[PDB]
Amino acid sequence: SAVQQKLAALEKSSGGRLGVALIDTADNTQVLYRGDERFPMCSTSKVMAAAAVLKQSETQKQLLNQPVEIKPADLVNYNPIAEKHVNGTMTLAELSAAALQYSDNTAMNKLIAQLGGPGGVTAFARAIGDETFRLDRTESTLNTAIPGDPRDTTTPRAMAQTLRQLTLGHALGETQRAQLVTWLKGNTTGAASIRAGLPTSWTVGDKTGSGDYGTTNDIAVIWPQGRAPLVLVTYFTQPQQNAESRRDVLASAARIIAEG
């Protein structure tokens, strides 16, 4: 196709490996580039964990309001929100917001613990029909993004369908899905990623991810004005373990998709 030519050229210019999945819910058509290759998720896995806790809150009605202790030993690699509350508490709502909107790794670990470990996040994925997602480690070792390692990976195809089911479909209850959509729309980390390649008049909710091997990810639900929303997944990873972040590739991939 024309979009796949331009994505392949973008990838070639970049020196890395690019994966894209678009779902146009208007006609349920799909655009895929390396749509079935595994990519390390990095922080994009935070969406699955927060959604799993939201699914729990469908039965435990006050769950999101339950306080969770933040202790000094809880801290790991990147904790911008949780480090403010050490020797205090945060609710599962404030932890879900921290994980999603600031990519707080300590908050992700509290969500994983609430679910019974990483297997509890993978379980929720299988429960909503995602056979591909796998969460194997906690923060921050899940970001090693080692070439060929299947741990903590998914494919663009699988994550686009899951993100659609979570935020536009009914994998969650309506209250829960509205809260996930709100959280995603308030992300603070995505300005240079998918959002940067899309028309300013479109509303976006997204979760970025970053890791070793210059892994630079973004998964987004996109609300253009007038037409049905879209779901866009852009994953990117690089040959060098110390490679720099390349959020510009995700922006350019979104731009190419939006023009097609």
Active site residues: 43
- At which residue do the structure tokens 């969460």 appear? 135
E strand map for 127-189? 153-154
What gap in Å lies between CA 11 and CA 173, rounded to an integer? Answer: 38
HSE-CB for 189 with a 13 A CA cutoff? 23
Annotated binding residue at 143? yes
- Is the N-terminal amide bond of 140 cis, ω within 30° of 0? yes
What gap in Å lies between CA 147 and CA 238, rounded to an integer? Answer: 9
3-state secondary structure of 140: coil
Which whole-number Å values give the CA distances from 137 to 19, 45, 105, in the listed order? Answer: 22, 11, 12
Annotated binding residue at 139? yes
* Positions at the binding site: 139, 143
* Positions at the binding site for Zn(2+): 139, 143
